[PDB]
Amino acid sequence: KSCCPSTTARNIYNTCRFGGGSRTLCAKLSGCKIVSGTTCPK
């Protein structure tokens, strides 16, 4: 699961990893955390 501290973060994240990059690389960008799914940080 990708946990983002903002909606803007998700928007940027999702589009970043939509075309290019990778989940983690894009999460790093937006401030989102690529987690498993047991918890969900902000």
Side-chain angles (χ1 to χ4, degrees):
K1 289 181 57 61
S2 307
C3 290
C4 297
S6 301
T7 41
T8 310
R10 289 227 59 164
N11 298 332
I12 298 170
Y13 166 76
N14 297 333
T15 47
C16 173
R17 70 138 187 179
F18 193 93
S22 186
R23 62 188 64 231
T24 44
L25 185 64
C26 293
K28 176 180 175 178
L29 177 62
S30 50
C32 302
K33 290 67 184 178
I34 303 296
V35 301
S36 52
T38 39
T39 40
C40 189
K42 288 292 178 186

